């Protein structure tokens, strides 16, 4: 059960890090688009 829950939380943390990376990519790419707006 220990190994089960550890693998579960490890995959959860991996998915969270991947989502963080995706969100940061979207943000940084949109911030460049945010500079384009001259208003």
């Amino acid at each position: 059960r220990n190994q089960q829950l550890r693998t579960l939380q490890e995959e959860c943390d991996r998915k969270l890090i991947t989502l963080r990376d995706e969100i940061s990519i979207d943000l940084y790419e949109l911030e460049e688009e945010y500079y384009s707006s001259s208003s």
Binding site: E11, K15, L19, E22, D26, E29, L30
Partner: protein, 118 residues
């Protein structure tokens, strides 16, 4: 007409660019004997050719800005249409990027729906 003020010449701003460009490179590509001893010699010439090149470039660019300003103060409708087209392109690009990000986030959250089977 070396000390004279007037410049008796014409036909420039077009041939000058290619001339200056090919000038200090023909020195390189040449089917002629090259003495195997030289230092700090061609450097002066290449600095001169790049200097005159960037100078005439600056001249052309300043002429372009002058013409553009005179056109805008003459025909502002053209500048207005240009700005409208630029704004349309910017809005289209923004919408495309927004749709792409939305689709990416959708695809991402969709596959990690039941990651925890439980």
């Amino acid at each position: 007409a070396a000390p004279g003020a007037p410049r008796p010449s014409s036909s420039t701003l077009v041939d000058e660019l290619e001339s200056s460009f090919e000038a200090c490179f023909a020195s390189l590509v040449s089917q002629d004997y090259v003495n195997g001893t030289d230092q700090e010699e061609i450097r002066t010439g290449v600095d001169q050719c790049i200097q005159k090149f960037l100078d005439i470039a600056r001249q052309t660019e300043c002429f372009f800005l002058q013409k553009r300003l005179q056109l805008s103060v003459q025909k502002p409708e053209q500048v207005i249409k240009e700005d409208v087209s630029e704004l349309r392109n910017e809005l289209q690009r923004k919408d495309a990027l927004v749709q792409k990000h939305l689709t990416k986030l959708r695809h991402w959250q969709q596959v990690l729906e039941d990651i925890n089977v439980q």
